[PDB]
A paper describes a structure:
[name]‐O‐[name], an important UDP‐dependent [name] (UGT), catalyzes the production of Ginsenoside Rg3 and Rd by extending the glycan chain of Ginsenoside Rh2 and F2, respectively, with higher selectivity for F2. [name]‐O‐[name] catalyzes glucose transfer from UDP‐Glucose (UDP‐Glc) to the C2‐OH of the C3‐glucose of Ginsenoside Rh2 and F2, respectively. In this study, we elucidated the crystal structures of both apo [name]‐O‐[name] and its complexes with Ginsenoside Rh2 and F2, revealing the acceptor recognition mechanisms of [name]‐O‐[name]. The NTD contains a seven‐stranded parallel β‐sheet sandwiched by seven helices, while the CTD comprises a 6‐stranded parallel β‐sheet flanked by 6 helices.
To elucidate the underlying molecular mechanisms, we solved crystal structures of apo [name]‐O‐[name] and its complex with Rh2 at resolutions of 2.9 and 3.5 Å, respectively. The apo structure adopted a P1 space group with four molecules in the asymmetric unit, while the [name]‐O‐[name]‐Rh2 complex exhibited a P212121 space group with two molecules in the asymmetric unit. PISA analysis indicated the absence of higher‐order assemblies in solution, consistent with the monomeric state observed via gel filtration. The C‐terminal helix (Cα7) extends from the CTD to the NTD, stabilizing the two‐lobe structure of [name]‐O‐[name]. Alignment of the AlphaFold2 predicted [name]‐O‐[name] structure with each of the four molecules in the asymmetric unit suggests that the absence of density in Nβ3‐Nα3, Nα5‐Nα6, and Cβ2‐Cα3 is likely due to spatial conflict during crystal packing, while the missing density of the intermediate loop may result from flexibility. Comparison of the apo and complex structures reveals significant conformational changes in the NTD.
Numbering used by the authors: 8 to 65, 91 to 167, 178 to 227, 236 to 288, 303 to 442
The structure:
Amino acid sequence: ISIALLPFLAHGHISPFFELAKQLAKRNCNVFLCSTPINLSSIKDKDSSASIKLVELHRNAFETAGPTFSEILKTLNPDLLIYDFNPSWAPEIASSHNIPAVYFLTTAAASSSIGLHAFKNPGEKYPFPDFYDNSNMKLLHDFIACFERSCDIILIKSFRELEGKYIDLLSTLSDKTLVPVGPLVDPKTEQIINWLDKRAESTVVFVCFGSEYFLSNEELEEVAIGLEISTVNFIWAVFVQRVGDRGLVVEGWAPQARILGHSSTGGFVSHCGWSSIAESMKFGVPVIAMARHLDQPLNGKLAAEVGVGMEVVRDENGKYKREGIAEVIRKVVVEKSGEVIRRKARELSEKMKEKGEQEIDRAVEELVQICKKKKDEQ
């Protein structure tokens, strides 16, 4: 019934853990304990009366706060622990208190399946050349650990409608049952909504590259002029700002969820972050893939494999050109050739909401199953 969460010390992992906390606190009234440093928990203090936040005070010294978290568990004594990828000692300290440990993967199943296959099956080739064409130690073991030490199941921030094939592959490779929990979700924003509401339905393209790379004056040019000749409305949260074909540039944080959820948005030029793609698919907004580093390319083609997006065609090797961007924008958002993509995005969104609440409900009942298998000898 009671669960304790130990995310990693990064706001990219605090939000998914906190949203999972809110989701598990509204079902089965799971007593919820979330272990975060006071500075990290401070940001989440807004609508969390359901969860209970617990402080943790410490080369991240995180790799030294083992006994501190041991003391926290000795006081809290949760019926189960949900750990992240890098705490390392989390699974070990939990077992020293006879607490079953379940791993929470906040990344796509395919990107992890890449490395997990290269270990479980060394020379057997990835099962799909289209996605990955296969044809020094002290880190590979630390990647599999969180999969190996996970008790029975592995929770994943993903949904079957996007990568059920890769989720099943990860299940077989890890020998664990992959349990998907689906996707998980200031006076300066009124101008944003007042602008988007006065535009027609599914005609605005939302452009954002997260905060990974502000690009450069050389790369901002290729996307700015590409948006100019696209001849479509856009909200590009970062021509000459005054000849922009009906667009709005924003400096810092933008209403990403509120823009994708607005009915006037019918396109999302994205760097293909996992949370970004999940949000784009929960609101039925097709994806314009413009990845560059990390697992973002694998994500992009992933959404391109299922048909809810399209990648820009690279003319060079470092970056793309305005034509490559304008062509795909016009094809997806405003042209008939992209109707396949738009239809799929809406149908998949309906499905993600048609099978609503069951996935986390099944996850909760399987977690309770884990807890009851541990009721051995009282």
